[PDB]
Structures are given as C-alpha cells and as structure tokens.
C-alpha cells in the first residue's frame, strides 16, 4: 500500500473511498486522504501518548476512560478543541474550591 512508502498507518484507500462516497464534491485529489491520515494519525498519536502517560501516572497498564478524561481535560488545546464532548465513565476533575475550606 501507499501508506508504508509515505510513513502512514491509517489506510489511504478507505479514506479516499469514504471521501468519494461521502457526497462532499465531484473531484477528489490524491494528497487529501494522505493529509487527512497524517492529521488523524498525529492527533490520535497525541491522545495515545497523553492517555498513555495518564495511565502511567496511576500505575496501571490499561487505559480506563478516566485516564483519557483527565488527559483531555488537563490539556488546554484539547479542552478548547472539545468543550461540549461528554465522555462516558470518565468522571470529573477533583476541583475543590478555596472558600469552602
């Protein structure tokens, strides 16, 4: 496939066929699914390394949704990117007010 010669992991044919059958435009370029798999691979690698270190903080070798919830909410760009997204079984942040102490 053309993903290995370009340094990609996600396939180009599935994204290109999904853009063809997704009713977006008449003509589809050849570098657009490569760019899309590059952006999705970098972002998915970012969530994988942030949730991976968040799983490394609580001394567990498995990723629970609370680690992904704290990994997304603890980052500013992920909270600004996704502010309305509700994560199931992720819990909330330990936010304790100062005046209630």
């Amino acid at each position: 496939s053309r993903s290995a010669k370009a340094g990609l992991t996600f396939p180009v044919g599935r994204v290109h066929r999904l853009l063809r059958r997704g009713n977006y435009a008449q003509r589809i370029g050849s570098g657009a699914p490569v760019y899309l798999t590059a952006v999705l691979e970098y972002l998915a690698a970012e969530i994988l390394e942030l949730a991976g270190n968040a799983a490394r903080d609580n001394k567990k070798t498995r990723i629970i949704p609370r680690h992904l919830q704290l990994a997304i909410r603890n980052d500013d760009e992920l909270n600004k990117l996704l502010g309305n997204v509700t994560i199931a079984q992720g819990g909330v942040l330990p936010n304790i007010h100062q005046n209630l102490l």
Partner: protein, 97 residues
C-alpha cells in the same frame, strides 16, 4: 458521651467519597418508568432496548453535575455556601437556555 460530628464535616468526606466513584447515582427502575412515562404520551406502545437508557441517564447525570458545578459557583458568587432557586435560574439562564 455520644460521638457526633459538627455540621460541615460529613459533606466534605461525602465529596471525597463520591468524587472518586464513577458509578451512577440514579436507580434503573424509576428512570425506566420515568422514560416510559415521558414516552407514553408521545407514541403509544413503544419498546426500549437494554442499551440507550444508561446513555440518557449518563448524559443526565453528567449534565446535572456540570449544572450543579456552575450553580455552585453561582452560589459562591453570592458569598454563601447554600444553593438557592435563583442560583439555578441564574446559572440556567446564563448558559444560553
């Protein structure tokens, strides 16, 4: 000599207890009869899957938690620790509703 806590202690350890738990705080059967009750007058003789009930209960629980946090900050702005009805109307209206 009875052993009693002062008012304001058990709420803090209830915050420490429930804030570490990801479980649902609403039972399945009153939410089931409630969802079927709202679904009664819309379309008669409907069916519900075993899924898609903890999704409504999950979004209701987390959305109500965020509403209690925004309303809690609204009660913090009033320089008191008690939540009032005008805090729910204030934090409900100021979110765009």
């Amino acid at each position: 000599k009875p052993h009693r806590y002062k008012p304001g202690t058990v709420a803090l350890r209830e915050i420490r207890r429930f804030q570490k738990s990801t479980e649902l705080l609403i039972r399945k059967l009153p939410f089931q009869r409630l969802v079927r009750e709202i679904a009664q007058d819309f379309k008669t003789d409907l069916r519900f899957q075993s899924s898609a009930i903890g999704a409504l209960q999950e979004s209701v629980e987390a959305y109500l938690v965020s509403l209690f946090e925004d309303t809690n900050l609204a009660a913090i702005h009033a320089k008191r620790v008690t939540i009032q009805k005008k805090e729910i109307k204030l934090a409900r209206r100021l979110r765009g509703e």
